[PDB]
Design a protein around this nucleic acid. Sequence first.
RNA 1: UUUUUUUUUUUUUUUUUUUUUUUUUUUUUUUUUUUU
Lengths: 241, 241, 241, 241, 241, 241
Amino acid sequence: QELAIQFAAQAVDRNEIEQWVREFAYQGFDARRVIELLKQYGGADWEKDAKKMIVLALTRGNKPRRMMMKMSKEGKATVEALINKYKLKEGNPSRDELTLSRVAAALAGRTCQALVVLSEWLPVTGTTMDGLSPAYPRHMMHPSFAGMVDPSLPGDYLRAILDAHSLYLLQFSRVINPNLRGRTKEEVAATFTQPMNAAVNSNFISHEKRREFLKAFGLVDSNGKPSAAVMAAAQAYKTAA
Amino acid sequence: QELAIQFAAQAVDRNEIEQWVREFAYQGFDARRVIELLKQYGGADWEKDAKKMIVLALTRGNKPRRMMMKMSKEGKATVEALINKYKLKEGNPSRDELTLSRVAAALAGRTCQALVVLSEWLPVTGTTMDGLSPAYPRHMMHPSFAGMVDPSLPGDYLRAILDAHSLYLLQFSRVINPNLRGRTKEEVAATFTQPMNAAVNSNFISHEKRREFLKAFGLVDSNGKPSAAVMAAAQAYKTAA
Amino acid sequence: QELAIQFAAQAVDRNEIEQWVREFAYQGFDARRVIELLKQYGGADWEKDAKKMIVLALTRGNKPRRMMMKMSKEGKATVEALINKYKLKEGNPSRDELTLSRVAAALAGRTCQALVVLSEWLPVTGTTMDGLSPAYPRHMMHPSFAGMVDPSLPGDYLRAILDAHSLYLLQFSRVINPNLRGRTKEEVAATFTQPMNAAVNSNFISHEKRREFLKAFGLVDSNGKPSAAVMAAAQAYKTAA
Amino acid sequence: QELAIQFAAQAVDRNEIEQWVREFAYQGFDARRVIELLKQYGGADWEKDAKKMIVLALTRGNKPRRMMMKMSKEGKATVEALINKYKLKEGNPSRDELTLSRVAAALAGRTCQALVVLSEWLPVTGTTMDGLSPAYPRHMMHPSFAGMVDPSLPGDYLRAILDAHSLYLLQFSRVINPNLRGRTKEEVAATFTQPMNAAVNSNFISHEKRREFLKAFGLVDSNGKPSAAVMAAAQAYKTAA
Amino acid sequence: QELAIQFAAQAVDRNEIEQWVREFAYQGFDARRVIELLKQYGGADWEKDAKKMIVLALTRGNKPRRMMMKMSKEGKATVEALINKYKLKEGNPSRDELTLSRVAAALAGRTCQALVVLSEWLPVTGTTMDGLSPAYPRHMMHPSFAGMVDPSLPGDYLRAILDAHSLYLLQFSRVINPNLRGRTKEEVAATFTQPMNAAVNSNFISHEKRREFLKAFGLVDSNGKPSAAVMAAAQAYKTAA
Amino acid sequence: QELAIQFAAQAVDRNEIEQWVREFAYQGFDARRVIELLKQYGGADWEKDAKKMIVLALTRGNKPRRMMMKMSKEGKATVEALINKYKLKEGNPSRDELTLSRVAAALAGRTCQALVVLSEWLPVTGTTMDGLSPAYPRHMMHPSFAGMVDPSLPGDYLRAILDAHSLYLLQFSRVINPNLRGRTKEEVAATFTQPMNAAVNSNFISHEKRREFLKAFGLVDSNGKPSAAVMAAAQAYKTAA
RNA sequence: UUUUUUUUUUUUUUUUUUUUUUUUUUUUUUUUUUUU
């Protein structure tokens, strides 16, 4: 009956396992087919509407019918136009459905750049983040930044980017979710660490191209070492409450 | 399909984003509507009644029907006269509605000045605040002070004003809300930091005019550096329980 | 629309605000009404019955019908005689109504002196308070003592009297209220600090006359500095659980 | 109206207050009523049965019908004989009713002496108490010991006896009451301090006679100073968890 | 009425109290009844079946009908044969009833020796106990060990054996009782300290014979001083969580 | 009656006890039944499907119907075929039923080898484990590793492997179980230590064969001493929160 | 001298939240609690 030893003695095929992990992957976040659906509904005006949807998701939220209740007449007409065109939903729906958070996650490059302008209009302001860590990087102030993180970066550097980004996520998750307010750092960390690592390890946008974005935003140097601003934020998360 | 890199490589238009944030803005509070409604119901006697309502909201509270139960005959007639004229409500109602807290928040300048006289009649007395931080600024002893804070001030100075003001808010929020009494500093901070930052970043009263008020109250010097009293209160909040 | 600056630029009238704070004060002014009602129902025998009501409120409680259930035949007749004459009630009723706690609060001078005799008959004994702070002042062992506290006293000294008195209130509030037993020092403090400060800042009995009582009880010296017994009790409250 | 100063200036009559406190006293315990009922049901064999009831309450508990379920045939007949004769009950009944705890509390002198023999048969053994404080006084190992404590003893000495006695109460109350196990020393203190002080300040057995018992048990010397064993137990309670 | 002083002045009869404590003892003294019942039901094959019942109670538990559900066909027949012969029960039944835990408790000498062989088959393994205290005594790894403890041993030595044994009980009680998992060291201690002390102070097996067993197991030396392994485990309980 | 001493004086037969522990063992024989059922449903294609089920259980989870909801068309396909063939269930079912966790536990050899390829796809990534302990062993990244642990290894070495493996289990159990997030290290340890020790002490795969696997994975040397990576992870668990 | 638990637990690019929260010279509890 002890024939499992022979099954274990078998040489592991690296690519045979790589085929099944991509097949049995946690699908739902879409990312690559978000752009496929954006051009399907939007057509030619998909780029202008995507820019509108990034500002909308960053300042207000993910639920479009809830934010429409407390909004201006000018906003009410523009938001409803996007819901009836792109068939936008709220929460975590199917693979073929679109949400405001999914549009911001797929176009992570434009989203991170928009955070420099939209600094004091976010649920967690830049001044609040500056209090925890002096001169906190504005580009890290959204969960979609995890899609811009290069996993090929060295261990100490990769952890320094993720720990600095987790400082915002700790504050942000407690603001948007009221039942996580009383819960400790470790309890809050367990809710955002899983979708964060999934966005870093996603095959969408190559390792070299992702590294170029981090250099352009002024997060890492020519080699890959993070800036003093990132290092201070990563150290602040270690002693955070 | 990976054409999102080209969309991300695009230079972000600062003013194009500024147009949409004002369009998709959160329709809440608005200090302009309060003054517009005060002159609509009051007429000419709106300034004298506003002075009465600021003192009423400072010493008693926001609920007018609840405070009327335990009040003198002189007060009962004057308070009911304001409810039937200005159509005053309790809690968080619609944009077209008025509350005692909204009147005190819109006219933040007069409210701040009234705290110097009404020091020992507040829920949190000046002597109690003096125990935590020696010679605590009396002008910071109301959540409406956030509307007098200048966001154009340097980072270190802007945080010093907000941290000093948060020392009162920590004590005040635990007094008016009984379920926040047992909860830690971080838990209490999360409830008042959001409407505080919204009042600082609000377009009502220019950055230069707001800076003049802080100088007049004796909080900041000719340049913008806060006084020793403000600096001690900001340091006290860092080590607060 | 930004005309609130002109309303704020107005010079604050100290006495105009002083008129409205007394008008919009909590209830239709206490203490004075109690003595006015005591002479109205009692007549000439009001002083002897007040002495009886002080001993009754200090040893038993505020509810007269509840304490009558577990009392001697001699007590049952004397207590019922006071209820039918002075129309005594239980809890927090209207301005024109009388309670055993209100009689003890109005005549704070006689109440504090009675605590020296009635030391081991209180819910919190003198021996129990002497364990927390060596030689705890017996005169502070009732919430009515707040009416004998002089607010004109220097900041450091005024806080020393209130912190020493709060050490008793922390123990007393947890004894009379069972749901406050499990709650921390900060949670218990928030329930008694509000009516305590209201009795200190009350206009009943002059600042100079109140200072004379504290000197007579042996709490403060000829100038206003509290005794070693008061200073030790104030320090004990800072490290109290 | 400020004529309360004249009422307060009056010299407090020690004896006049002493008359009303005994008149308006709270009834719950019995002491005199217990012995009156023991001779009423027992008659001549009341002294032999009281000795049996002290051993029964000390080793087993207060509930007689519950302890009979897990007892020998010899015990079952003797215990039931006491229930049918003295009409013994369980819990906190009326003044005219008797319980095993009330018999042990009324005859505190015999109960404390029985603890020397019944040392390892108690819920909290003498060896367990020796671990907390070396050579712990055996006479203090029952809540009925509070009835033997002399309140006329000096402050430092009176607190030393109560703090040493509370060391047992802290362990015992957590053993019999399972919901008090998780609660801190201060939370446990609040449940036993009220009936403890009531027994100390009770008029049953004079101050001089109570002092003689403490001297006979070897707790205090010829003057009133407690022994090294009591002093060590009082110091152990101050640092107890 | 104060005639209790005369009743207390009476000389306490050591043996008169000793008669009633044995009469009013807790029905659990089955140490004699178990062996008496094993000889009645089993007969001559009682010694072989007792050895089987010790291994069964140590590895599985005290519920014979519950453990039979998840067991081999060979075990199912042997276990059911013991239940139908000795009339074995589960839980806490009457005096003249037998349970797997009662058989292991009565024959404590064989049970403790079986723990050396059955080390990794217990609910709490020997390797787990070695992590808390290096080289933890295997003979102490069962609540029945309390019946092998000599109470005539010196105070410091007696406490060292009990504190070392309590380290296992703390780990064991939390494994078998799931609601005790979240509860602190003090809460768990209160549940096992009472039946532990009862087994130590039990008259079954003389003080000298009990001391010989502890010497034979290698727990105490020729005089009575415990080994370095026992001393380390007693120190580990003091700093345990 | 005290004849238990003679029964205890008897020399314990090591193998006589070894016969009864295997007879009165928990369950039938798990791990053996899994392979027996895999060949029963699978037949010849059981080895290829087992490799697919290992990758599926490691990356997603134990519930097959829940993970199918958020998966690709290619993924939804291969998973549903395995449920209808092997009759796969979710949770803790009967002995004759199969789960994804049971397949991974029985074939522990290939499961440990799959973790060097699938490091960043696990709920707890390798980079996260590297932060707690530098260069954490990738073969210890699953609860099924306990089945590869050799119990015949020396005490200090055996504890070093289990303490290093417990570092992952502490992080993993808090990720998959949300109510264990707030609970301390000791509370989380009590839930995984019991099934861990059961897999180490299990008779499936001999002690010598298990030792060969740990040498092949690069965990222990030629004798049995663990590597510096394992020693650092075991030390990290001792100071872990 | 009781409690006898079980290779289990499989969570999720989302939980997107609001210038709000306005509490009270009040609260007046009782030699009890007796667990295995």
